[PDB]
Amino acid sequence: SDKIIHLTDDSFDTDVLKADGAILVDFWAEWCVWCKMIAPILDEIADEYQGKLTVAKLNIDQNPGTAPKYGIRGIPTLLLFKNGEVAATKVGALSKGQLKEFLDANLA
Numbered sequence: 181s182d183k184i185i186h187l188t189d190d191s192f193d194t195d196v197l198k199a200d201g202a203i204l205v206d207f208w209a210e211w212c213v214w215c216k217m218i219a220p221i222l223d224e225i226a227d228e229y230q231g232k233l234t235v236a237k238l239n240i241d242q243n244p245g246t247a248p249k250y251g252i253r254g255i256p257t258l259l260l261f262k263n264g265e266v267a268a269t270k271v272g273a274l275s276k277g278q279l280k281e282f283l284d285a286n287l288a
């Protein structure tokens with residue numbers, strides 16, 4: 181978790197929208213089992229994509245206003261931002277091999 185960024189509705193603008201470089205955001209919740217299952221995968225990817233990517237999480241339970249703006253229908257949902265615009269999205273849990281493929285298809 182040392183390579184993951186914790187966002188708040190507040191910090192969203194700065195840390196994601198104004199952010200320079202690719203930002204992968206994990207919209208999740210407390211009592212979502214699938215959310216808990218990808219947490220470790222998110223750790224590894226983070227470590228492997230340092231310099232190229234910033235991995236960040238958003239607990240919609242404690243940050244209820246961001247999701248809606250993005251059409252978030254269910255969790256976990258992963259949003260890949262670029263230059264303040266969402267570049268790609270993935271709904272639901274996936275493996276590390278999957279997450280990798282998904283980024284690679286988007287990483288410049």
Ligand SMILES: [Cu+2]
Pocket residue numbers: 181182183184223
């Ligand atoms: Cu860590």
